[PDB]
Amino acid sequence: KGVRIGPGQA
């Protein structure tokens, strides 16, 4: 899990 904040992220 976990939120990805950045380019080309989930």
Epitope: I5, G6, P7
Partner: antibody, heavy 131, light 112 residues
């Protein structure tokens, strides 16, 4: 002792090719995404492209200004990142640096948030495309 | 010519405050999160702000960031001669290649 060291820069004729190398050390290479960025004299930084980690597919993305001419690849067993440049143009002249995508993790009351950013930066290698 | 536009330079005396603007579009600053970097000569860029306004551990609250519409701002109060350096904003593009994009950079001079 976290670092990136690039080499391979040099003088090349327009239409020529050149391959740059970036050696990593001090951290688990295979676990991170890497970028190639460049900066021409007296100008702003420009992202060249990225290559994802094996776990995320190991795929590549390229800036519109270089796609089709530049190829990025990695060799996790050698902690090495490569940038193969073909059909070089004078406007490709610049200092080329490799960087990793790192992150700041925040533990939320529910989910963990990962904010990515260019973390480690090499000192760069200079590429001059001119006749 | 930089994707994100920043004033070339800014200055103020020690103890004063300054703001450094970063102008972009909907496709970069508008849709995504802003980062700010501090860079000294011959040294790698250092993360000052991430997520528009978050400070990494080690960065004192004199440094602050904010984002509004298609622009972002870096504020620095209580100027220290040690702050004289280059500052640049960064975020990513919403395009097909999701490019990291950068501001041209602003040189902060702490009047000495």
């Amino acid at each position: 002792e976290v670092q990136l060291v690039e080499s391979g820069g040099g003088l090349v004729k327009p239409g020529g090719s050149l391959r740059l190398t970036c050696v990593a050390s001090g951290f688990t290479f295979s676990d991170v995404w890497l970028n190639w960025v460049r900066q021409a004299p007296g100008k702003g930084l420009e992202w060249v492209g990225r290559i994802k980690s094996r776990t995320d597919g190991g795929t590549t993305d390229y800036a519109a200004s270089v796609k089709g001419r530049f190829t990025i690849s990695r060799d996790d067993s050698k902690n090495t990142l490569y940038l193969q440049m073909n059909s070089l143009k004078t406007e490709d002249t610049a200092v080329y640096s490799c960087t990793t995508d790192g992150f700041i993790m925040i533990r939320g009351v529910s989910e963990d948030y990962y904010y990515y950013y260019m973390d480690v930066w090499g000192k760069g290698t200079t590429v001059t495309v001119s006749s | 010519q930089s994707v994100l536009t920043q004033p070339p330079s800014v200055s103020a005396a020690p103890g004063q405050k300054v703001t450094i603007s970063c102008s972009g579009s909907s496709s970069n600053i508008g849709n995504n999160y802003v980062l700010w970097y501090q860079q000294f000569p011959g040294t790698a860029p250092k993360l000052l702000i991430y997520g528009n306004n978050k400070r990494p551990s080690g960065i004192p609250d004199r440094f602050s960031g904010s984002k509004s519409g298609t622009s972002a701002t870096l504020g620095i109060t209580g100027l220290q001669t040690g702050d004289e350096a280059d500052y640049f904003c960064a975020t990513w593009d919403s395009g097909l290649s999701a490019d990291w994009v950068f501001g041209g950079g602003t040189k902060l001079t702490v009047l000495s």
